[PDB]
RNA sequence: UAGUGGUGCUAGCAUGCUGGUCACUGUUCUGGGCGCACGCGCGCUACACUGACGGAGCCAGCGAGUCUAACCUUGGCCGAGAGGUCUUGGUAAUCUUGUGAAACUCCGUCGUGCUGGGGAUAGAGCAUUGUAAUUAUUGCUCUUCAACGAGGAAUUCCUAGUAAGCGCAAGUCAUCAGCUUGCGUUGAUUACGUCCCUGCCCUGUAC
């Protein structure tokens, strides 16, 4: 099987109510338990992050992790 | 609307992957000759195959066997000067490895060293 | 004229030199301000001389660095060890020995690399 | 279940390779009761080893 | 008072090359989006449309802190490894007639001219306009 | 405290800095305790340093790199393989982010579940050969040394063709061998070990 | 023939800071040759995310150079590049040269798919050295995209600024190295012991 690469409606809704759900994101925490590809995954942090759901303690390029707050 | 495999010149790409990679599947069609039609095509390059429309699949296909018609620098081109008319050519699909696997008969033909090594060897 | 010191620091082939004069606070490396020292992760260890001692005993103080040569790593020590011989040498000179050793206790205590280089050498062969 | 001892006394190098150095050890929860040990790693004076199986004493 | 010496080199260089673009006189080769800025490069530059500006700012801020400049030690400065193949890598210099032409763009403004001694050096009125730019980004923070 | 205002203004979380020393200005070692009295003088935490960058020789006696910090200890044994030698300033980033993603899975001062990962790990008794093996006791400096190589391998091995950074995957081990998790790498071997020594004494 | 600071002139910023421009520390000629079913050995490049690619940051040391004429080349100009052209300094701590080197650092793209890993083999064209490049010296551009998923039995080097990573200079030399020697940059883990294996050196009876 392959992961999703284009957001279909019923996954961003489904992104939106689970997110805040953990403890702990991250690029390899969506791709690995929400089936989407990894280019969707920083573009997602950036809107969540800006939409204020998500709390960013540090940022990496390489890596980034942010928190439930 | 999207489309999961498309097919042009008798070649089968798959929507899922980004325009200019995707296209690559066309034998004759290298990553700089890919990116630079899609520039002079002005499609987003970061849009997915899947994405376009047939009016878009179009005008691609039209500028990768009219090339010079847009004023691609020619040195941009794997047939420059060609032996029979001084024409220059880019060479697309089933077309490559036909006139491949063609200059090496006509090399037999003249009896010259390279074509009977090549054919010695097989 | 004015109260003013030159002292110089070594690592591997890298070669700090410094200056300090009687001023205000202020400190540059080859005319930036030490704040913009790179790469971002051994900044900190570039701080050591400031927040191991005080800021305070910088006030009165204008201090100006040139690396010359080494590399990325072996330059940022250099300049570190220049920073600190400048400082005793200066109270040395315009203080005490009380303080100039008040300053020497709290360098040593946290790494003798602050005074004394490692005297390490390439193989002779 | 675990005991801890301290090295008293260090003996020599033994096993074929040298790689095991014999050891005179005293029981730190109580004193006496010494024993001679196997050690396998660099060990010095004072360091504590912890005697997982107590009744067995070394060859020598 | 501020220097250029005072801001963090990458961000006084996206400052002033949004500026620039805005400004509009920068004139660009045409050939842009063609060419791989180094014959060790693979692929072209992938900010296609704004890295003429980017560049543009960099070559600027360099000759601003020091005495002169001249092509060929540009040429030096942005080159870089090339993979050879199978062959170990060794160092190329990038493309000269990108870098020429940027010198010859910027002095149509007014920030740099010809210097004796050779090369190019900053002129008043490029100190006078830089210094500006890194007051607003000082201060923009 | 006071903003003490200095010509080249120094940012005020650095001013803050001034009166306690924090391992990436970010976590005291204060309060960090090891758990078993044996490795105590191994356990190099008492010494305080900003960054994992320490210059120091300790190749002179053989007993001296007991007196280097555990966390320099773990950022050389990242820098292995030959395509990552010399790769201090790789390795020293790796950690930094590694120390912050145990302060959000958990809870508690990460320093403290470095430790007490090195503390549970260390195998406490081995075997020679003799052929055949027999059972010999091991010293607390190797138990140390056991250790911190488990745990990188462990980690290693899983984030080759990975999808989760170094980073991701360092810290999980870390966390599940500060538990009793079996889940462990570090702690599977440890387990081997010392039940084959059992049998043959 | 080196560095710092002051002094004179001077630019920008602000009402001091960063830059440019006196003191101290036999003979000979033409053409060819120096091919590969396979065995053994020293190497180069990889199997990817501790990564590949794009932009930006920006740091060495040891060498070597012409009047015998033509070496190392700055600056201006032309061209996508390779490369070309007009001038210039150095017989050298004085000029090339701060040999602005690579790894590396930061910000983006890619998302575990022989994939954007890897670049063998092969087609077309443009240049450069040489008296002459066909069986092809080297460089540049486009196109073609092979094996290879960390490798059985065996086996090499090594204890600190050392191993390993990375690059440069000289050597040979019309041109042409994946070679040899030297130099610098980043920089670990594991012993500080033994005679088990291998090999060497001392002092009569089952052989």
């Given at each position: 099987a392959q992961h999703a690469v284009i957001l279909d409606q019923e996954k961003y809704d489904r992104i939106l109510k689970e997110v805040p759900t953990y403890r702990y994101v991250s690029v390899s925490v969506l791709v690995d338990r929400l089936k989407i590809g990894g280019s969707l995954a920083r573009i997602a942090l950036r809107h969540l992050e800006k939409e204020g759901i998500i709390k960013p303690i540090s940022k990496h390029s390489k890596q980034a992790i942010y928190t439930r707050a | 609307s999207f489309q999961h495999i498309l097919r042009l010149l008798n070649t089968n790409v798959d929507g899922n992957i980004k325009i200019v990679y995707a296209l690559t599947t066309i034998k004759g069609v290298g990553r700089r000759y890919s990116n630079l039609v899609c520039k002079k095509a002005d499609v987003d390059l970061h849009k997915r195959a899947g994405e376009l429309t047939q009016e878009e699949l179009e005008r691609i296909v039209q500028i990768m066997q009219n090339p010079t018609h847009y004023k691609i620098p020619a040195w941009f081109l794997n047939r420059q000067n060609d032996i029979t008319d001084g024409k220059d050519y880019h060479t697309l699909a089933n077309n490559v490895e036909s006139k491949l696997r063609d200059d090496l008969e006509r090399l037999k033909k003249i009896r010259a060293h390279r074509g009977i090594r090549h054919f010695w060897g097989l | 004229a004015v109260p003013s010191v030159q002292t110089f620091g070594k690592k591997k082939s890298a070669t700090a030199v410094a200056h300090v004069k009687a001023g205000k606070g202020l400190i540059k490396v080859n005319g930036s301000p030490i704040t913009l020292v790179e790469p971002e992760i051994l900044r900190f260890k570039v701080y050591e001389p400031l927040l191991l001692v005080g800021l305070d005993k910088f006030s009165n103080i204008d201090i100006r660095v040139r690396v010359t040569g080494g590399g990325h790593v072996s330059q940022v020590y250099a300049i570190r060890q220049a920073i600190a011989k400048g400082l005793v040498a200066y109270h040395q000179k315009y203080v005490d020995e009380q303080s100039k050793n008040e300053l020497k206790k709290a360098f040593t205590s946290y790494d003798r690399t602050l005074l004394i280089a490692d005297s390490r050498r390439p193989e002779p062969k | 279940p675990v005991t801890l001892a301290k090295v008293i006394k260090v003996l020599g190098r033994t096993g074929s390779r040298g790689g095991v150095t014999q050891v005179r050890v005293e029981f730190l929860e109580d004193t006496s009761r010494t024993?001679?040990?196997?050690?396998?790693?660099?060990?010095?004076?004072?360091?504590?080893?912890?005697?997982?199986?107590?009744?067995?004493?070394?060859?020598? | 008072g501020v220097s250029v010496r005072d801001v963090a080199a990458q961000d006084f260089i996206n400052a002033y090359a949004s500026f620039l673009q805005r400004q509009g006189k920068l004139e660009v080769p045409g050939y842009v989006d063609i060419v791989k800025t180094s014959s060790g490069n693979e692929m072209p530059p992938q900010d296609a449309e704004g890295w003429?500006?980017?560049?543009?700012?960099?070559?600027?801020?360099?000759?601003?802190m020091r005495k002169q400049v001249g092509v060929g030690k540009l040429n030096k400065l942005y080159g870089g490894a090339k993979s050879r193949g199978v062959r170990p890598y060794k160092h190329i210099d990038a493309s000269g007639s990108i870098n020429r032409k940027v010198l010859q763009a910027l002095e149509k403004i007014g920030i740099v001219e010809i210097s004796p001694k050779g090369g190019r050096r900053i002129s008043e009125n490029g100190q006078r306009d830089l210094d500006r730019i890194a007051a607003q980004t000082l201060e923009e923070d | 405290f006071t903003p003490v205002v200095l010509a080249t203004p120094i940012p005020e979380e650095v001013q803050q800095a001034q009166t306690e020393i924090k391992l990436f200005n970010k976590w005291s070692f204060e309060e960090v305790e090891v758990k078993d009295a044996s490795l105590?003088?191994?356990?190099?935490?008492?010494?305080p340093i900003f960054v994992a960058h320490t210059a120091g020789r300790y190749a002179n006696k053989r007993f001296r790199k007991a007196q280097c910090p555990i966390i320099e200890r773990l950022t050389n044994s990242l820098m292995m393989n030959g395509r990552n030698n010399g790769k201090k300033l790789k390795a020293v980033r790796i950690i930094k982010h590694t120390l912050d993603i145990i302060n959000v899975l958990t809870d508690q001062n990460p320093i403290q579940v470095v430790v007490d990962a090195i503390t549970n790990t260390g195998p406490r008794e081995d075997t020679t050969r003799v052929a055949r093996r027999q059972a010999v006791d091991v010293s607390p400096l190797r138990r140390v040394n056991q250790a911190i190589a488990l745990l990188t391998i462990g980690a290693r091995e899983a984030a080759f063709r990975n999808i989760k950074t170094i980073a991701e995957t360092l810290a999980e081990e870390l966390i599940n061998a500060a538990k009793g998790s079996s889940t462990s790498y570090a702690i599977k071997k440890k387990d081997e070990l010392e039940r084959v020594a059992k049998s043959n004494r």
């Amino acid at each position: 099987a392959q992961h999703a690469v284009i957001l279909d409606q019923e996954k961003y809704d489904r992104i939106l109510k689970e997110v805040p759900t953990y403890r702990y994101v991250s690029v390899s925490v969506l791709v690995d338990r929400l089936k989407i590809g990894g280019s969707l995954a920083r573009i997602a942090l950036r809107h969540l992050e800006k939409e204020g759901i998500i709390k960013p303690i540090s940022k990496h390029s390489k890596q980034a992790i942010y928190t439930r707050a | 609307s999207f489309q999961h495999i498309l097919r042009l010149l008798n070649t089968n790409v798959d929507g899922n992957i980004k325009i200019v990679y995707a296209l690559t599947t066309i034998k004759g069609v290298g990553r700089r000759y890919s990116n630079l039609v899609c520039k002079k095509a002005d499609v987003d390059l970061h849009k997915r195959a899947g994405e376009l429309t047939q009016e878009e699949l179009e005008r691609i296909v039209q500028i990768m066997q009219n090339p010079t018609h847009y004023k691609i620098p020619a040195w941009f081109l794997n047939r420059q000067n060609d032996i029979t008319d001084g024409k220059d050519y880019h060479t697309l699909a089933n077309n490559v490895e036909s006139k491949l696997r063609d200059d090496l008969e006509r090399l037999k033909k003249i009896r010259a060293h390279r074509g009977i090594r090549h054919f010695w060897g097989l | 004229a004015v109260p003013s010191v030159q002292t110089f620091g070594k690592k591997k082939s890298a070669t700090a030199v410094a200056h300090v004069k009687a001023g205000k606070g202020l400190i540059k490396v080859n005319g930036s301000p030490i704040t913009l020292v790179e790469p971002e992760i051994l900044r900190f260890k570039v701080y050591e001389p400031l927040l191991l001692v005080g800021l305070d005993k910088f006030s009165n103080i204008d201090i100006r660095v040139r690396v010359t040569g080494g590399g990325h790593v072996s330059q940022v020590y250099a300049i570190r060890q220049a920073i600190a011989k400048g400082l005793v040498a200066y109270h040395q000179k315009y203080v005490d020995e009380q303080s100039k050793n008040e300053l020497k206790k709290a360098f040593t205590s946290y790494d003798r690399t602050l005074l004394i280089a490692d005297s390490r050498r390439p193989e002779p062969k | 279940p675990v005991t801890l001892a301290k090295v008293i006394k260090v003996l020599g190098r033994t096993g074929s390779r040298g790689g095991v150095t014999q050891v005179r050890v005293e029981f730190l929860e109580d004193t006496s009761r010494t024993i001679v040990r196997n050690v396998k790693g660099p060990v010095r004076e004072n360091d504590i080893l912890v005697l997982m199986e107590s009744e067995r004493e070394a060859r020598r | 008072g501020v220097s250029v010496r005072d801001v963090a080199a990458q961000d006084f260089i996206n400052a002033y090359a949004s500026f620039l673009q805005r400004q509009g006189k920068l004139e660009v080769p045409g050939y842009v989006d063609i060419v791989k800025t180094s014959s060790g490069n693979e692929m072209p530059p992938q900010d296609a449309e704004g890295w003429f500006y980017k560049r543009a700012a960099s070559v600027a801020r360099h000759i601003y802190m020091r005495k002169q400049v001249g092509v060929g030690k540009l040429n030096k400065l942005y080159g870089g490894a090339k993979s050879r193949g199978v062959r170990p890598y060794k160092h190329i210099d990038a493309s000269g007639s990108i870098n020429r032409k940027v010198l010859q763009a910027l002095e149509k403004i007014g920030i740099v001219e010809i210097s004796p001694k050779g090369g190019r050096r900053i002129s008043e009125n490029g100190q006078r306009d830089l210094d500006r730019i890194a007051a607003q980004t000082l201060e923009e923070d | 405290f006071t903003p003490v205002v200095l010509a080249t203004p120094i940012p005020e979380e650095v001013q803050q800095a001034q009166t306690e020393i924090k391992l990436f200005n970010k976590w005291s070692f204060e309060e960090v305790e090891v758990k078993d009295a044996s490795l105590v003088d191994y356990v190099q935490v008492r010494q305080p340093i900003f960054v994992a960058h320490t210059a120091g020789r300790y190749a002179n006696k053989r007993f001296r790199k007991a007196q280097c910090p555990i966390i320099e200890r773990l950022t050389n044994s990242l820098m292995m393989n030959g395509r990552n030698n010399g790769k201090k300033l790789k390795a020293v980033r790796i950690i930094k982010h590694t120390l912050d993603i145990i302060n959000v899975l958990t809870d508690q001062n990460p320093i403290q579940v470095v430790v007490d990962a090195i503390t549970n790990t260390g195998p406490r008794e081995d075997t020679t050969r003799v052929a055949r093996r027999q059972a010999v006791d091991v010293s607390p400096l190797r138990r140390v040394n056991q250790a911190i190589a488990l745990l990188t391998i462990g980690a290693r091995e899983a984030a080759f063709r990975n999808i989760k950074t170094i980073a991701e995957t360092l810290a999980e081990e870390l966390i599940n061998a500060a538990k009793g998790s079996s889940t462990s790498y570090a702690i599977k071997k440890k387990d081997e070990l010392e039940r084959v020594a059992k049998s043959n004494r």
